[PDB]
Design an enzyme around this catalytic site. Sequence first.
Site, PDB file in Angstrom:
ATOM      1  N   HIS A 131       0.804  -1.223   0.000  1.00 30.64           N
ATOM      2  CA  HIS A 131       0.000   0.000   0.000  1.00 30.64           C
ATOM      3  C   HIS A 131       0.842   1.281   0.000  1.00 30.64           C
ATOM      4  O   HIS A 131       0.262   2.360  -0.066  1.00 30.64           O
ATOM      5  CB  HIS A 131      -1.082   0.034   1.108  1.00 30.64           C
ATOM      6  CG  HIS A 131      -0.599   0.239   2.521  1.00 30.64           C
ATOM      7  ND1 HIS A 131      -0.229   1.494   2.990  1.00 30.64           N
ATOM      8  CD2 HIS A 131      -0.562  -0.635   3.554  1.00 30.64           C
ATOM      9  CE1 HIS A 131       0.079   1.323   4.266  1.00 30.64           C
ATOM     10  NE2 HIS A 131      -0.119   0.061   4.653  1.00 30.64           N
ATOM     11  N   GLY A 144       2.326   5.880  10.561  1.00 35.85           N
ATOM     12  CA  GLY A 144       3.752   5.809  10.254  1.00 35.85           C
ATOM     13  C   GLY A 144       4.403   4.514  10.715  1.00 35.85           C
ATOM     14  O   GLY A 144       5.548   4.227  10.359  1.00 35.85           O
ATOM     15  N   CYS A 154       3.422   1.490   9.823  1.00 35.10           N
ATOM     16  CA  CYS A 154       3.265   0.480   8.765  1.00 35.10           C
ATOM     17  C   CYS A 154       4.620  -0.022   8.305  1.00 35.10           C
ATOM     18  O   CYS A 154       5.541   0.775   8.135  1.00 35.10           O
ATOM     19  CB  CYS A 154       2.450   1.029   7.597  1.00 35.10           C
ATOM     20  SG  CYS A 154       0.712   1.363   7.989  1.00 35.10           S
TER      21      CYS A 154
END
EC number: 3.4.19.12
Lengths: 298, 302
Positions: free
Chosen positions: A41, A136, A138
Amino acid sequence: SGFRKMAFPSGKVEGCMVQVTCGTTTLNGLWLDDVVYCPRHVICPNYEDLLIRKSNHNFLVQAGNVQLRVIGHSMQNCVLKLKVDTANPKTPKYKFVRIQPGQTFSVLACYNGSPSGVYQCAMRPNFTIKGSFLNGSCGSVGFNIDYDCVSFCYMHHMELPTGVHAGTDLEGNFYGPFVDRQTAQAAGTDTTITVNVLAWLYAAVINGDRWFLNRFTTTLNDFNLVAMKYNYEPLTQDHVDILGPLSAQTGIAVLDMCASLKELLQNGMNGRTILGSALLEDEFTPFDVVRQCSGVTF
Amino acid sequence: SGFRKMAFPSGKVEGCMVQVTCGTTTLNGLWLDDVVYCPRHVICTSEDMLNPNYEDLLIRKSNHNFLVQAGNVQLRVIGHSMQNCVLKLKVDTANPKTPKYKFVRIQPGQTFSVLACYNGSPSGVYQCAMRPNFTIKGSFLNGSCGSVGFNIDYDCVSFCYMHHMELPTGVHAGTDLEGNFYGPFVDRQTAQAAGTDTTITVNVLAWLYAAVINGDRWFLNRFTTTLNDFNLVAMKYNYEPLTQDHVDILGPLSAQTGIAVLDMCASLKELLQNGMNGRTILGSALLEDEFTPFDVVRQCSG
Ligand SMILES: Cn1ncc2cncc(NC(=O)Cc3cccc(Cl)c3)c21
Ligand SMILES: Cn1ncc2cncc(NC(=O)Cc3cccc(Cl)c3)c21
Ligand SMILES: [Cl-]
């Protein structure tokens, strides 16, 4: 003495954390040899259509204050694999492993390719993790360390509306019925990890807490009929076998400790605590208890 | 979202752990530049421990009596000195993995990460607080002596604790990195006991503010309290007195949530009176006191 929620030393993993930027999105990557792994993503959906429009120089990879130059890119399920020019010299001995619900692991939470904290947690029966993540985070990873080998088992992808977390193994396969996009998705009804609560009751006995013990025993079937009523995971014969070493160490048969758990479920703690807790703890596996109450090093 | 007891990444500390042996005793050392720091009771036998004269025991030792192991490499000891309850072994090699560091002495209520080690090998990392009675509720087995407590702010490691002993109740006692004990403890096998422990009030309030930030307001009430009336109630629950410095420290969290510190105190008084009534706050059925106001800001904001 003492019993704490303990994570593996994060050092071997800290040397792999990088920052990945593409457009406006900035998240974390795992640099192992000449490949950087991160959630797909980061390009955001038709992921093949979005990836085909990207060139190598669109992905900015940062390893500390050094920019890595991307020389290739491919997708494997929900993970993006960025081929870089430089092999990571701090790459440890590693494996990619997929874990089962109930299994525990350490999470090294990162923001902008910089590790900020380490915590221990379990894969819930509903495939979510009760983590501590902000925007942040991820690309932060979950791992176990066996001997000198780091087993990467989780990569953080998203937060669900209830505050719990969802992610994939390092091959990009989600844990649970989740997809990586902005849509209506919710965690299923969660259950307590029974084999883990029993392991934690054995850890309490090892630390000198015996108030919950009784003279009674139970059949596995009668225990599971009780446990099913209290939203506890069914206890299998494999679970009973796995608890054997702790049973031998304390002198309390697994079905004897099940009768103690049956009374705690039907009657509560009555103002008492077990290992400083007023709730029955399910995020320590039988192996975590053995490793902590025996002192295994890495 | 989410609130966990979180330890600092242990990597910068793992690269400093060594094994120290003196005769039969083996424990952990902290190797920073060309000095290895370890508890001075490494020179003692079990029979020395009742009334050891450390100066008398150390004067009988030579450099080659101390065996230091950094991984599979033996370090050569070229000097030794004692500073309070820490032995400082001068070695012939500076640690190339020495991080940017400071030695800091902390106050009760402060938190830190512990890297538990056995034979110079790190086995686990956990979070904990310096209790008001100067003990730590750790998880340590025999051989863990010399394990260290630290914080990492930015890229600097602040060493604040070195493990020395386990008290009869199962709690742990140790020193700062200059060898001064936290609490009225001595490195002697004498009858010593932890004082009556108390709850770190400023920390419970910080944790209640963390719950409000994560959307949990069930425990709030329409009441306020004077600081004095709060401390009279708190004392009866074995809670540490809340000072005006504590109230000042909680200001940022008060401004972020819109709940005045003395209003959060009124809610704590009510929680102490009523209990939780089957409810939880941040997944806990007890009032949590091992998260400081600074930890809450760090974890909920950055
Ligand atoms: C934005 N945010 N706040 C907290 C938090 C914790 N962990 C992760 C995130 N980020 C996301 O959820 C981003 C995202 C959104 C939709 C779909 C996907 Cl696959 C990912 C967090
Ligand atoms: C022996 N043992 N079991 C658990 C444990 C945890 N941490 C430390 C120790 N070790 C000690 O207490 C050793 C000692 C004895 C008397 C005086 C001093 Cl200063 C030191 C432990
Ligand atoms: Cl302090």
